[PDB]
Amino acid sequence: LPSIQLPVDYNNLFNEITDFLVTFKQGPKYMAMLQKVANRELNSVIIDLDDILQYQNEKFLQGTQADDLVSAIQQNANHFTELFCRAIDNNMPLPTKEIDYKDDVLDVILNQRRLRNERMLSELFPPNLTRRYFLYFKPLSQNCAAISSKPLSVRQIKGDFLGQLITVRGIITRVSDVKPAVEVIAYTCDQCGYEVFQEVNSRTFTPLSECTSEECSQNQTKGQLFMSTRASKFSAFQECKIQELSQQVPVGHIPRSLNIHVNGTLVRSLSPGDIVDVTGIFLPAPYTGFKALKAGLLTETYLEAQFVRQHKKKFASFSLTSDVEERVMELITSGDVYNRLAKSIAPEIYGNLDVKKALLLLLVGGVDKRVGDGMKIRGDINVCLMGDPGVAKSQLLKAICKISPRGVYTTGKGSSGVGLTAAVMKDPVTDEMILEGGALVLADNGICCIDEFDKMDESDRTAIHEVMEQQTISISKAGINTTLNARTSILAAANPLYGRYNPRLSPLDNINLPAALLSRFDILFLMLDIPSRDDDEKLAEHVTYVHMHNKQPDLDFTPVEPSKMREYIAYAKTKRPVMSEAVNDYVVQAYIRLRQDSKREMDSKFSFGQATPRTLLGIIRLSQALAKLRLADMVDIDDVEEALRLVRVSKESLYQ
Amino acid sequence: DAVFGDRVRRFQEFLDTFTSYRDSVRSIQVYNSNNAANNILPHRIIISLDDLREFDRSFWSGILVEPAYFIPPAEKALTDLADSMDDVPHPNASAVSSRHPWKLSFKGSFGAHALSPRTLTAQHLNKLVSVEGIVTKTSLVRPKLIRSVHYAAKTGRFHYRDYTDATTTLTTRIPTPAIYPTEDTEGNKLTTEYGYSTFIDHQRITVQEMPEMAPAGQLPRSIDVILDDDLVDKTKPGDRVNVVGVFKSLGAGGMNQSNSNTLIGFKTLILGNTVYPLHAARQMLTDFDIRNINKLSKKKDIFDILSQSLAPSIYGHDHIKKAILLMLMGGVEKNLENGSHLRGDINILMVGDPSTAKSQLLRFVLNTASLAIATTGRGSSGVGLTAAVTTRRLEAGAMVLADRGVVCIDEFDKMTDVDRVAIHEVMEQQTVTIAKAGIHTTLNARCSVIAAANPVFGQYDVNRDPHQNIALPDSLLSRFDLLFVVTDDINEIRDRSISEHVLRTHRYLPPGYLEGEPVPKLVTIPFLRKYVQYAKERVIPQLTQEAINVIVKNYTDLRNDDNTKKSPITARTLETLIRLATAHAKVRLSKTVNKVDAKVAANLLRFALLGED
Amino acid sequence: EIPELVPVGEMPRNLTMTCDRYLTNKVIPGTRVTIVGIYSIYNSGVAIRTPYIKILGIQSMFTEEEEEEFLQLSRNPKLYEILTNSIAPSIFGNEDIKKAIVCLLMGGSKKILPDGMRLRGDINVLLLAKSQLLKFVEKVSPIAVYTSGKGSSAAGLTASVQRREFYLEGGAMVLADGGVVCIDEFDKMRDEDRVAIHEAMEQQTISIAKAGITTVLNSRTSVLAAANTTILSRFDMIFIVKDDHNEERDISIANHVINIHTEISIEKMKRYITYCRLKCAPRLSPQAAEKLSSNFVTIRKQLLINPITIRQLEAIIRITESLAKLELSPIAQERHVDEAIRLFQAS
DNA sequence: TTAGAGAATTGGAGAGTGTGTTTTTTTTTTTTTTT
DNA sequence: ACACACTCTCCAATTCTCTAA
Numbered sequence A: 001l002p003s004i005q006l007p008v009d010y011n012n013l014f015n016e017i018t019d020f021l022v023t024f025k026q027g028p029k030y031m032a033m034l035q036k037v038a039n040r041e042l043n044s045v046i047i048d049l050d051d052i053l054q055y056q057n058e059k060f061l062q063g064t065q066a067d068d069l070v071s072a073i074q075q076n077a078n079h080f081t082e083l084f085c086r087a088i089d090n091n092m093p094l095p096t097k098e099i100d101y102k103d104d105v106l107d108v109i110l111n112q113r114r115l116r117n118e119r120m121l122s123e124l125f126p127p128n129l130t131r132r133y134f135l136y137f138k139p140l141s142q143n144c145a146a147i148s149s150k151p152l153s154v155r156q157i158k159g160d161f162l163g164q165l166i167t168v169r170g171i172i173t174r175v176s177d178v179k180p181a182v183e184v185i186a187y188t189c190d191q192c193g194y195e196v197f198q199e200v201n202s203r204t205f206t207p208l209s210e211c212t213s214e215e216c217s218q219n220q221t222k223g224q225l226f227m228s229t230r231a232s233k234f235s236a237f238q239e240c241k242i243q244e245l246s247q248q249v250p251v252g253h254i255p256r257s258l259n260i261h262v263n264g265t266l267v268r269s270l271s272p273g274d275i276v277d278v279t280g281i282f283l284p285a286p287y288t289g290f291k292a293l294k295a296g297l298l299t300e301t302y303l304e305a306q307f308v309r310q311h312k313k314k315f316a317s318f319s320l321t322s323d324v325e326e327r328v329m330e331l332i333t334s335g336d337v338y339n340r341l342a343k344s345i346a347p348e349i350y351g352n353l354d355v356k357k358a359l360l361l362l363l364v365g366g367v368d369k370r371v372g373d374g375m376k377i378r379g380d381i382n383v384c385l386m387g388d389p390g391v392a393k394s395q396l397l398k399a400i401c402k403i404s405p406r407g408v409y410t411t412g413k414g415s416s417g418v419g420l421t422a423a424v425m426k427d428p429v430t431d432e433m434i435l436e437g438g439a440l441v442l443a444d445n446g447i448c449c450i451d452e453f454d455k456m457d458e459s460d461r462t463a464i465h466e467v468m469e470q471q472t473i474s475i476s477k478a479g480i481n482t483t484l485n486a487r488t489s490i491l492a493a494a495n496p497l498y499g500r501y502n503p504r505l506s507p508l509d510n511i512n513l514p515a516a517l518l519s520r521f522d523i524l525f526l527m528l529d530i531p532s533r534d535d536d537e538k539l540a541e542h543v544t545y546v547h548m549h550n551k552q553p554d555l556d557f558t559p560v561e562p563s564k565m566r567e568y569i570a571y572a573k574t575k576r577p578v579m580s581e582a583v584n585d586y587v588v589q590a591y592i593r594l595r596q597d598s599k600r601e602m603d604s605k606f607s608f609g610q611a612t613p614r615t616l617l618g619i620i621r622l623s624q625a626l627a628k629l630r631l632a633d634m635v636d637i638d639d640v641e642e643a644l645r646l647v648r649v650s651k652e653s654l655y656q
Numbered sequence B: 001d002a003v004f005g006d007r008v009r010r011f012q013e014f015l016d017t018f019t020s021y022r023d024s025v026r027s028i029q030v031y032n033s034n035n036a037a038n039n040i041l042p043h044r045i046i047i048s049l050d051d052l053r054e055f056d057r058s059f060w061s062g063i064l065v066e067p068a069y070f071i072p073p074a075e076k077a078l079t080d081l082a083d084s085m086d087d088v089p090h091p092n093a094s095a096v097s098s099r100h101p102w103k104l105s106f107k108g109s110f111g112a113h114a115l116s117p118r119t120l121t122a123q124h125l126n127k128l129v130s131v132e133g134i135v136t137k138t139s140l141v142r143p144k145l146i147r148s149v150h151y152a153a154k155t156g157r158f159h160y161r162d163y164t165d166a167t168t169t170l171t172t173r174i175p176t177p178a179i180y181p182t183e184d185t186e187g188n189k190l191t192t193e194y195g196y197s198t199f200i201d202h203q204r205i206t207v208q209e210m211p212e213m214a215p216a217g218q219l220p221r222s223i224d225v226i227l228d229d230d231l232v233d234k235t236k237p238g239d240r241v242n243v244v245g246v247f248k249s250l251g252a253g254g255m256n257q258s259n260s261n262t263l264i265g266f267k268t269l270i271l272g273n274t275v276y277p278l279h280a281a282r283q284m285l286t287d288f289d290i291r292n293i294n295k296l297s298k299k300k301d302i303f304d305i306l307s308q309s310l311a312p313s314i315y316g317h318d319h320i321k322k323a324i325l326l327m328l329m330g331g332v333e334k335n336l337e338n339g340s341h342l343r344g345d346i347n348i349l350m351v352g353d354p355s356t357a358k359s360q361l362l363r364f365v366l367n368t369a370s371l372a373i374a375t376t377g378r379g380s381s382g383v384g385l386t387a388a389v390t391t392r393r394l395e396a397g398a399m400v401l402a403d404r405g406v407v408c409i410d411e412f413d414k415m416t417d418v419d420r421v422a423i424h425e426v427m428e429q430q431t432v433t434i435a436k437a438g439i440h441t442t443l444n445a446r447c448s449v450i451a452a453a454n455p456v457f458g459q460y461d462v463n464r465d466p467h468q469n470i471a472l473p474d475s476l477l478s479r480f481d482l483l484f485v486v487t488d489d490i491n492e493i494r495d496r497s498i499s500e501h502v503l504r505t506h507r508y509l510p511p512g513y514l515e516g517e518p519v520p521k522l523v524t525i526p527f528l529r530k531y532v533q534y535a536k537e538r539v540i541p542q543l544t545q546e547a548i549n550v551i552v553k554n555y556t557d558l559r560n561d562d563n564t565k566k567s568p569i570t571a572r573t574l575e576t577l578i579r580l581a582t583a584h585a586k587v588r589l590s591k592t593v594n595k596v597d598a599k600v601a602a603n604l605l606r607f608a609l610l611g612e613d
Numbered sequence C: 001e002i003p004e005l006v007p008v009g010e011m012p013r014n015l016t017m018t019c020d021r022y023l024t025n026k027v028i029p030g031t032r033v034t035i036v037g038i039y040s041i042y043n044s045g046v047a048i049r050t051p052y053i054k055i056l057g058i059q060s061m062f063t064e065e066e067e068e069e070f071l072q073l074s075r076n077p078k079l080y081e082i083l084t085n086s087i088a089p090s091i092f093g094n095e096d097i098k099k100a101i102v103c104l105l106m107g108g109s110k111k112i113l114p115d116g117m118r119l120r121g122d123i124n125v126l127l128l129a130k131s132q133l134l135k136f137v138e139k140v141s142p143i144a145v146y147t148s149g150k151g152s153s154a155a156g157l158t159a160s161v162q163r164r165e166f167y168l169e170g171g172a173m174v175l176a177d178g179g180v181v182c183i184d185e186f187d188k189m190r191d192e193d194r195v196a197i198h199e200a201m202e203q204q205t206i207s208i209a210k211a212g213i214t215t216v217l218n219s220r221t222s223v224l225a226a227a228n229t230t231i232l233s234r235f236d237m238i239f240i241v242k243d244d245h246n247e248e249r250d251i252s253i254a255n256h257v258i259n260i261h262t263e264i265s266i267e268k269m270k271r272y273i274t275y276c277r278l279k280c281a282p283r284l285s286p287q288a289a290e291k292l293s294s295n296f297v298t299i300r301k302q303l304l305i306n307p308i309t310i311r312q313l314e315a316i317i318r319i320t321e322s323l324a325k326l327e328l329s330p331i332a333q334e335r336h337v338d339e340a341i342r343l344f345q346a347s
Numbered sequence D: 001t002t003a004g005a006g007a008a009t010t011g012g013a014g015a016g017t018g019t020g021t022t023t024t025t026t027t028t029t030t031t032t033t034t035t
Numbered sequence E: 001a002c003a004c005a006c007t008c009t010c011c012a013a014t015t016c017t018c019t020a021a
């Protein structure tokens, strides 16, 4: 009933929008996109607010006043999706190329309807019915920066923000599968042969049932309406949920969450377990009909997604733009990348260089193989660290957990073999049975870190056997019978029996693992804490420096930063280097010697069990990883001898 | 109607007379106006109910007996005062029509209206009351609509409307249907302007009488409270709290036609006006405290004074007292630029004969640390001590609850092997991680551990190895910074001294009591708590080359020289030296660690480790 | 309905009823009452309604002259003998057992220090015929609980966690808080209670951190126990019951049994014990301190040339205070110290 | 034989009224404390 | 307040009948 004044007039802002779309350039930037839309080449338009800020600054420096459109579309974001769409529809250019127009049902229907009106004469339909494109806003760069550039945790999203454009940081908990949602519905009248349309915005609607057209009415033609899919307009819909990071929850509270909606080409971007910076519009969800009359003033709410930024680029997302090319050329031209990359893993830890080199080869991994008859062979590498207390095992393990784009960390005592693999939970109130994957599934195509491996129960450790070699999980339980994919490499850490390693016994007595499991690791590294006045002094001088400066001590060596390291590793995981006959003869001859030496010494104090055929393929996998890191397309004997050295060094700790 | 204006005038006279409230309005406004140009303070003021009594008794009793007729005009007058004071020009669209007035809160002298949930009675309805109890439940936060704004497409005019519900206002009005208008009076189609509309936060809680007051094992009684705007989420379950607000009734009570024959009663609530906690830990320093703390720190031997003032009722064990003081101060926690973490908190273990004050000394820490949890070793399971699953929801254990605090474990030797191994992560990585059916999560647990145990043979046997006397694995003993062995060696003068000491202790009488009625210098514990709090917040000592020169030499000699030492020596021993030196420098309020601190830390570790100084 | 009215083999019938204004909050559960009210029906089959009643009416520290008697008792020169004689008078002999029960009923004095440490007031005794004394203690004590070693539930003696969500319940150590508790066979204690009673006795608390529960329970009580090892160290005094076989005693008991089949009284003594606990909490004189410390070092030296420990010196002090409490003397004296060490011969 | 003026019978347009709606197992997988 | 089921009422469309050219 009443009315107020406000500082904003939308006519001025509409004029600014139509100038911006036809003038801005880094021809003008957005007219190329609209030409691609007109050619049917492109389905969505992404508006950059950095452009609008730049445009405002340039117009100001030319000595003229202008409205602050950037804050104006952040404060009340919902309304401007319509203004930009009307401007785009007004200014859309004509096609540059032939289209085959007759493929469109709506074109035929509207052409015939226009012809009917033309004959009869001897808005027509809602404009939403012919918008072939989607439109989204991208928030301000924080380095140019405003609230949309600054991430909020899910607790900080108060009721003040309803209507605004914001950014949210958290973990995704669940994702729905895609289904269609109506936008414009189409009907046919039987007796008078005429078509009518209805537009849907709310969660529910009543379909039409009477032909209220004036011509039909004046012919007293009370015809029947029928619905049609073939000329209705749908859009893809998906719903998700986001939840705050566990390390940001205040003490004694339960974590909170938000509902996310996604439409258009942005669909199936999110996935469960992702850590992500989502940005969008935060809105209420009104009730409808009789429910609204007795629901009260408490409103449900949700987030309309507009753009999504991931924290770590998955290795599958790689493509060699020249921006990346220029950076990998730095490492390639500098040379000796193997040592530099290994030295760059956890620089705050002194020494341990061979362990770091082994863990770099774990990050790269071997080549997947699939024979013409259907047999397949594991490409992943498995590694284990066995050693005394206080030698940085947990610390080094947790450092590698940062580099990998997909990975999880777990400890032996806190873990169930079920929850480690996959569980059949009677989760809903409806008594339904549903399968939910465990840690080894969440680490699919990544690394799984298992600390305190010696504390985990002997029965529960057997769950890992199938995943380690076959990279799959098989379940046959109440109402569920399926196989899941688990393409994951395992890294584990343990103390020997009795804690500190005991020289009175053999290595196998100290290790205390069964034969079938000890074989599934490609490398097991044995590391012992033996005092030395000389080495202890150097280690202490290094650690004390680190505590003093927060920096590793350096005179010669500069580590590569983790980002450039990820780019190099991601580029290196694409190569698939092949073997050759000269190399094959050498490794074939090496394998015989290993088994003969094992047979000779099964009695001996220097025994470590017997070399199985899985030790041959371990050599091939390590060799191929080394070939990948030098960006080759061919394994070289130089790789094989290093792969043998790296296996030999694991046992030298036994000899003080 | 006319009476509303006069009440606004009379409260304006009060606000002009008692000027300390104008300063409050103005200071909040200028603070908010400053940082807006770059957190924000709420538009709320607390008035002393005594000032209002001395100013006008007729207004005082009106607020206190008829709040629905006196609180609204008073609050209106406060908003006019804040609005007439100068404010930033050219407000934005949302600021122009925020629908956000200032709000009141009260303190002091409620008299007869200070109550508890058991005694709140139908006579007190519509009065302003104060209640005390324990929070038991809290709802989720929800937004609530109060105003909406609409733009008319053809005419270019902005329209608006307001909404009400029975819990939003002290006075009573016709309820509103929560519908959005789609069309103008003149037939123009409307659009809704989110971001210009106004929504507020809402939360319901429940408060119950304290269990100490429950009669005869009878059922306890409780009330529901309504909170909104600024008051949301300032409490959690288990809090002891005192709430101020108006006590009111709701609904039709079955007189709107029902099957009950109207035997059922009306519903009732308290509308939260102000909330205060109860202490049942933290203290806030006055200026004089800063002066005294800084002056005392320049004595020659502050460490001796402070350490001997811990548990003066316990004779002997000087070194354990010094170790506990350094534990309460702690080291400095490091986070490196690559995300790597280096531990800061000190863990202590003590093992010894029966009756040698182990449990008695362990009990003292629980009553001087700001956050402390206590448990017996056999009364706790691995999951209960770290974390457990429920319904999926994950529930914290004792080590997760004391995050930045200390945890005390008595009868540590009785804990089973299956329970002990759950602790190996928490004492170094300072986290808890679970991987069970339907759950994977990491939790933080940053505390310091102090614990007591009995040796294997019931008394310590010097004629057998320390490993034979102490049945724990080497990987666990390595995680304790200081390991103390203590025994009851029989000697004449020692026995005489201790016995005379405990007899002098048992002859104490508290100050306010006649004899037989039932109930160097030492700083008082209430001052020592302030000293520890100040030192832990305001000083962060950085390491120096002179300290490092001592630390490196001591570590390499101690590790390499062959001796009958009672604990394994590893890379973690070096960190214990750095932590102890940093904590001693912090006692001294020094901005940097010096050679003296490193020397003292070495002389403490040598005593505990090699048994002799 | 009244228990002595119900027809045999049937569970009792009941009614629901309403009251308002001054008739509210006038009664509590378990009380027998008489009611006047209108009997009527209300809405809540065909043409059928529930009945109820509207109520219109319901029916259901010391004086000066009391404490004068207690004061006259306090100045009697043989009061200690009188109270010992008044305890289980049918039981022959066993003088020191009766003396120890008097001290257990009277207790020492609680104290709190400037550094916040807290000093225990209670007493604990163990007995190795014996069934009668625990029942007598249960009757004479102002507050009392009686149990056998297995306990009344899966809580046992101390407490336990049970299960569906988990919960916790306390046994007969938590329930007797503030009073006395007596155990009828201490050897039948369960495994969890064997370890948990250490905290319950030394700390006067029970603490649990299991299945997400994290709480501490109060256990402020004096324990009397009997049976038929290291657990004896928890008690202040231990004694073994003794018997005599006079035929006249059994004949007298049998004659009394036939009579039912065909010195100070309990209530007065209970009220006196209550009065003394409320009025007096006495302190050691310096002479007692020199005496006790000299005796302590003497016993340790004698044992060294041939154990006593501080946790037993602090028990002798509590016994000494409890002996001075009978006289209402505000100070304890060498007279009490002598009888305290004399009675300390548990062996 | 056409047609036009007057009377009677029927249909359904459309206006009105009242109404209803929100909201003890038994079998099977998994974690936890208890003997 | 929002779709439905059911009731009531008035008005004009229709066919039937009588009269005269």
Ligand SMILES: Nc1ncnc2c1ncn2[C@@H]1O[C@H](COP(=O)(O)OP(=O)(O)NP(=O)(O)O)[C@@H](O)[C@H]1O
Pocket: A348, A349, A350, A351, A352, A387, A388, A389, A390, A391, A392, A393, A394, A395, A396, A494, A495, A539, A543, B343, B428, B475, B571, B572, B575
């Ligand atoms: N070479 C090293 N360089 C730097 N710090 C080291 C080195 N070796 C050991 N440390 C320190 O040793 C401490 C303990 O490391 P941590 O990873 O917890 O040991 P761990 O091998 O997991 N021992 P445990 O879990 O008992 O088997 C850390 O603070 C490290 O800084």
Ligand SMILES: Nc1ncnc2c1ncn2[C@@H]1O[C@H](COP(=O)(O)OP(=O)(O)NP(=O)(O)O)[C@@H](O)[C@H]1O
Pocket: B313, B314, B315, B316, B353, B354, B355, B356, B357, B358, B359, B360, B361, B454, B498, B502, C202, C310, C311, C314
């Ligand atoms: N200076 C002291 N030295 C030793 N014990 C003392 C001292 N002062 C008091 N005590 C008393 O010693 C008794 C036993 O102390 P407590 O701390 O329980 O020993 P403990 O080491 O825990 N023995 P235990 O429970 O068998 O492991 C208490 O009653 C204390 O009051």
Ligand SMILES: [Mg+2]
Pocket: A393, A394, A395
């Ligand atoms: Mg570790």
Ligand SMILES: [Mg+2]
Pocket: B355, B358, B359, B360, C202
């Ligand atoms: Mg003790």
Ligand SMILES: [Zn+2]
Pocket: A189, A190, A191, A192, A193, A194, A211, A213, A216, A221, A223
């Ligand atoms: Zn039609």
